[PDB]
Structures are given as C-alpha cells and as structure tokens.
Amino acid sequence: ADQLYLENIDEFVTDQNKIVTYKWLSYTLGVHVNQAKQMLYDYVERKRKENSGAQLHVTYLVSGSLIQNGHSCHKVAVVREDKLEAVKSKLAVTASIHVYSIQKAMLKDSGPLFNTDYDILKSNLQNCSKFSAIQCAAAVPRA
C-alpha cells in the first residue's frame, strides 16, 4: 500500500531527477489531486526525518485574504519553502496551504513548475477534470 507510492516518488525525484508537482503526480499515479498533495507531504517528512539533510527542495501553495487599504484581496501563490512562513504571516485570514512541488535541485523561478504541468496536460488533454476535486453535471460533451 503506502510504502509503494513512497518508492515511486523517490525513484522520480532522486533517481530520475524529475520535478514532482501534485498535478503531475496526480496524472502520473492516477490519483485524486488532493491525495497527491498529501502524498508529497508524507514523502517529504519521511525523507526529512530519514536524512535530516537529504538534498530535497519543496514549494507550497499558500492562499488567503490580504487587505491593502480596507479592501480585501484574495491571494493565491506558489512559494519557495523558506518564504512560506513570511507569506503566511502577511495574510489576514489564510485559506489554503499544501505542498506544490518536490525537486532534487532548487528552481531558479517558478517557471519550470508550469512547463512540467503543461506537458503532462497536453498528454492528458483528453480528461482534465478526471482528478479534480470538482465534478460538473453539465460538463458532458454534447454541444
């Protein structure tokens, strides 16, 4: 069971040197977009307790309310591991936090995080909402 998806991810990051985004893993292992995120989470903790200094880099998605001038603006951002604390603080009320990606080598910009997700999409273009947390009665090919 579990010990399985763990190796899978290791083989991906460490051995294959691939950038692992929840979406990418979602489609790759064929798992609910959320459970994919939870998967990355568990994987880092292990590898983190395990080595306590394994060459591993994480990025998170932080989303929440951020008031500027009495006017409340919702912010959605993919941040680098360190900065998470900072961003999380600047928010008035925080709504979402979860792993976004896992890479052996640090990333210059969030750029590749797109490319990765973009490619895996073009190949699954067939069924985008397959692992989404939202299903729409109407979104059925008819018109």
Binding site: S65, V93, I97, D109, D117, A143
Partner: protein, 408 residues
C-alpha cells in the same frame, strides 16, 4: 455590501492537505448552473438616439427643475429665453482632448453652440443631455444647469440562499508576455477547476456558477509569426477546454479577435476552438454581453466603450468612466449610428462590468428610483494576473491574484 467575499467562504473550513494520504477524499459537486438566460440578442446582428432618449431626458429635467417646462426645441428658441433644450453633444477644436474644446448641441433640425458652466473635459461627442439656459446675443446658448437620463427602471434580483460566484477575467493575452504570465494563468484555471487548494478553496470554487472571459485573450516575419499566432490560439483552446470541462464558460471577443471591429462584435468562430467547443458548457457570446445568472442581471463589454470615452474625456478612473455611461443611459455614446439604439439601457443591470482595465475596480452605486448596481472593472490579467470574483448573493467583488516566485 461586504460578507460572503471569496476568501471568507473559502477559509470557512478546516485544513487537511498537511498530512499523510487518507483514503477518504472529498470531491465536490459543482453548483447547479441551470438558471441562466443569455439575453444579448439585441447585440447580435444620431437622431434616433435623441428620439428614444428624449422621453427620458425630458422626464428627468421635468423632475429636476419642476413643472416649469423649458421644453423648447432648438428652433423655437427666443433670444434671452430661459428654457430647456434636449439634444446631442459634439466636441471639436494618450487622450485627444484639446486645451480648449467646444460643445455644439444638435437638435433633429439645427445645431446651436454652447456657453455657460458645462464641463467639456468630462463630456464627449455622442452624449445625450438635458441642457438649461438661454440663447444669447452671441448666438451661442449659455448653460446654467444640465442633467442626464441616469439609470433605467430596475426590479431587484431575487434572493439567493447559498452564495454563487462568477469569475470575471480579462486580457489573458496569449502570444507575448513571458511564461510568468503563464503559471499565473494556470493557477487561475486550476483554482476554478478544482486542481489546487485545500477543501476550503475547492468547496468554494465549487460554488462558482459561471466564468466570463471579456476579450483580449490573444494579443498582437510571416513564417514564424503565423506559427506563433497559431500556437497561441491553440493554447487558448486548451485553456478554454480545461475550463469547459469543469464549469460553464462564456467567451467575449476583444480588440483584435477574429470578428468585426465595430462595436457590437459578433461571437468568435467555433472553427477556432476545436477542443473546447466539444463541451456544451463552452459558449461564444456577443461583445456587449447580457445574461441573467442565477437571477442576477449582468452586462459588460470587453472594454472598448470605456477605452474610447477615455480617449476623449479627461476622466482618469475607468471605474468612473464606467459609472459615467451608466448615468448617461448609454453603454458607449462614443459609438456611431446604425433602428433602436441597443446601447441604451432598457432596464438597469445588477452588475455592470468592463473590459481590460489596467487595474481592478469595484463599487456599488444607487440610482434615482433607488436601484442597486455593482460596477466592476476587470483588469488585464496579462499584466496584472488578477480577476474579480463576484458573489451573487451579496454583490461583493474581490480580486484574486496569482503569483509564483522568481529568482531572488
């Protein structure tokens, strides 16, 4: 109105994604996008204006200045007579306003010039006002006070028990801008779709009822230029696809999209979005777009109308220029005649939005016969990466901004 903003309803519940995989996984059923009615027919294809506006401007001036009917056409004017003329304005000598412009008032018959206290930097060619003053020794008409038709009648939108959202976006501008413009865009799509975020976000994104893209989705040798332009469109298809597979999406033509440049831009051609059009949820609508979502009357354009009023006005704030048109009962007076002016509000919208504003904007305004109207200026995502989310049970706009770290 403040309550039920997105972020609020979104954080409304416990976190979960910071823990080892559980088997139990929430998958949300989107809200019933079943109560919709596109009503932009009158968009699918200057006297006449004056003719339709007359009744309005007159009944406005009559209440604004009392029974004292100044109702006198441009011809029946007696030098030095205090009356009220109803007509069209013409101006003549970034922004093309001239240091000192001048306003001529056209009646069906003749056309008199104007003096007095009337702002010119503010008004522009095509407006239909109710001027008040007298004709002078100069031959010019001196004005002391003027007014406009304002807002049309408007019955209240029915009450909603559970919040419903409408995501308004604009200016995706595919073709140029740098991949950062992309991730941002992916994140946008991914939020409405249900890809990113925790159950809170998701359960609320799930509450989004429809998504309106207001023009400028693509933006602008031959060998590669072609390929590029082709690629772009391709992506927009892919984006529209993902969106279509999850929620209802309405696309609006923009600046230079494959359709007429004139104002009532007719829809885009299905021949462009193979991938997307496969879904009954995708829908290519007219330019000035009208529809009733979950009982709320929306009306907006992909921008142009405001873009022009700006070129010939002094008004800076688009949100204002936007409010302006709503007060002048005319979506885009700066537009030519061609036989009922569609651009004259028959009834008053509930939400009135605008195209590629350079900045997010929102305001609720009220009218003579207490009407409520939510204005919105949807920024150009290309350079802002922001969009408004309007909750229909409270009329609260709130921007949503996406971003990903850069080398630093």
């Amino acid at each position: 109105h403040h309550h039920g903003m997105f972020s609020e309803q979104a954080a409304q519940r416990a976190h979960t994604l910071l823990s080892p995989p559980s088997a139990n996984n929430a998958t949300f059923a989107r809200v019933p996008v079943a109560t919709y009615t596109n009503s932009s027919q009158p968009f699918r294809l200057y006297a006449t204006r004056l003719i339709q506006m007359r009744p309005f401007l007159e009944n406005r001036a009559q209440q604004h200045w009392g029974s004292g009917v100044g109702v006198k056409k441009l011809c029946e004017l007696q030098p030095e007579e205090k009356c009220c003329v109803v007509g069209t304005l013409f101006k003549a000598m970034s922004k093309y306003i001239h240091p000192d412009d001048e306003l001529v008032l056209e009646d069906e018959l003749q056309r008199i010039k104007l003096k007095g206290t009337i702002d010119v930097s503010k008004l522009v060619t095509g407006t239909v006002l109710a001027v008040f003053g007298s004709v002078r020794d100069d031959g010019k008409f001196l004005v002391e006070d003027y007014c406009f038709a304002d807002l049309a009648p408007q019955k209240p939108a029915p009450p909603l028990d559970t919040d419903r959202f409408v995501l308004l976006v604009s200016g995706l501008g595919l073709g140029g801008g740098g991949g950062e413009s992309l991730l941002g865009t992916q994140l946008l799509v991914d939020v409405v779709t249900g890809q990113l975020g925790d159950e809170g976000e998701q359960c609320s994104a799930a509450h989004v009822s429809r998504v309106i893209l207001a023009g400028n989705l693509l933006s602008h040798l031959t060998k590669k230029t072609q390929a590029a332009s082709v690629e772009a469109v391709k992506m927009l298809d892919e984006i529209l696809l993902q969106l279509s597979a999850s929620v209802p999406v309405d696309v609006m033509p923009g600046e230079f999209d494959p359709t007429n440049y004139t104002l009532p831009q007719q829809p885009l051609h299905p021949c462009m979005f193979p991938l997307a059009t496969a879904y009954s949820t995708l829908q290519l609508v007219t330019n000035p777009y009208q529809a009733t979502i979950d009982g709320v009357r929306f009306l907006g354009t992909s921008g142009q109308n405001v873009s022009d009023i700006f070129r010939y006005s002094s008004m800076e704030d688009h949100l204002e220029i936007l409010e302006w048109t709503l007060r002048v009962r005319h979506i885009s007076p700066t537009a030519p005649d061609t036989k009922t002016d569609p651009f004259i509000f028959p009834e008053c919208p509930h939400v009135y939005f605008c195209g590629n504003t350079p900045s997010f904007g929102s305001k609720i305004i009220r009218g003579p016969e207490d009407q409520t109207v939510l204005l919105v200026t949807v920024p150009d995502f290309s350079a802002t990466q922001t969009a408004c989310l309007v909750n229909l049970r409270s009329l609260a706009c709130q921007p949503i901004s996406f971003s990903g770290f850069g080398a630093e």
